[PDB]
């Protein structure tokens, strides 16, 4: 359980570098270089953790190590846009390609052994790596690289759909929710690539397919709540928020103001539902499920922030910023309670919610002036 908690801490550190790169978009070159140095350090540390997890046979810890590697490449690509550095954008592209190739081998090994949870996490690392490739290709202006992102992301979407159906037939609702997370992240990679290419039809297909993921995640959350699995229910709410982020990105490029207003309404329902799961998880003592509920709250506020910025809704933007600070304070209290009871996994997951809430705050500051 120590290798899993170590990888989750590296995930939170990678998200901290993303917020640093997002804040540099203030237009500060030295701030963008500080986010670069943190991203390369997290990438190297997660590489050593991946080798240790593979040496011990912990496929779950090895997959989480690759997820931190993909988030480190995303921060490197975001710094490339702020610095206009094509040489550094090429390095982020190369590092993201190595994560995609490593996660592909791990997904095959986990599928043959029956570990559906580890296989779903490997697909999440592939989808996150494709987001880094899309951002790096945008900084380079490579139309050939943008088309490769769309083709690879379609393979991740198809692999996650087969894994979701297999997990649903076996009753593994945790792996089924993780498979829907990889689908929503893969659609985000396509949306970013289709925007730079100006593909209206592909953006229209992302919107309808993300709605299908949103409806499937609502069914998993209701089934997990009936069985008493609050961990799977919180993961299903995370997939709901990530699917709404993909719909917002597509509605932004297509100029669908009515769809953006529906995203805010739906994301508010996910945020309120995640608050009920948090109260139920804390009452029964499930600190891992409670931390995942705060993660779903932060992602739901990110979807609200993106839609309100494109709509110019300052009242809703101010509301999401206030709720983001409330999530950050609650996660700090949960981290103290988790370490007081020796639950290092929940303590690391609470740190991920803090970094996610800081990303939403950075998004609000980006639109201010």
Author numbering: -1 to 23, 25 to 368
Paper text:
Here we describe efficient routes starting from validated parallel and antiparallel peptide assemblies to design two families of α-helical barrel proteins with central channels that bind small molecules. Computational designs are seeded by the sequences and structures of defined de novo oligomeric barrel-forming peptides, and adjacent helices are connected by loop building. For targets with antiparallel helices, short loops are sufficient. However, targets with parallel helices require longer connectors; namely, an outer layer of helix–turn–helix–turn–helix motifs that are packed onto the barrels.
We chose four protein sequences with <85% sequence identity, high pLDDT and low Rosetta energies for gene synthesis and expression in E. coli. The other protein, named sc-CC-7-LI because of its a = Leu and d = Ile core, was helical and fully resistant to heat denaturation as judged by circular dichroism spectroscopy, was monomeric according to AUC and bound dye, consistent with an accessible channel. We solved a 2.5-Å resolution X-ray structure by molecular replacement using the AlphaFold2 model for sc-CC-7-LI. For the parallel targets, the experimental structures show minor fraying at the C termini of the inner helices compared with the seeds and models, which appears to improve the packing of the external three-helix bundles. However, the symmetry of the central parallel helices is maintained. The backbone RMSD values for the repeating helix–turn–helix–turn–helix motifs are ≤0.5 Å, which is expected given the low sequence variation in the loops and the hydrophobic cores of these buttressing helices. Finally, to test the robustness of the design to mutation, we substituted all 49 a (Leu) and d (Ile) sites of the central α-helical barrel for alternative design rules for parallel heptameric α-helical barrels (that is, a = Ile and = Val). This protein (sc-CC-7-IV) was highly expressed and was also folded, as shown by circular dichroism spectroscopy and SEC-SAXS, hyperstable, monomeric and bound the reporter dye. The success rate for making single-chain constructs from these initial five parallel designs was three soluble proteins (60%) and one new α-helical barrel crystal structure (20%).
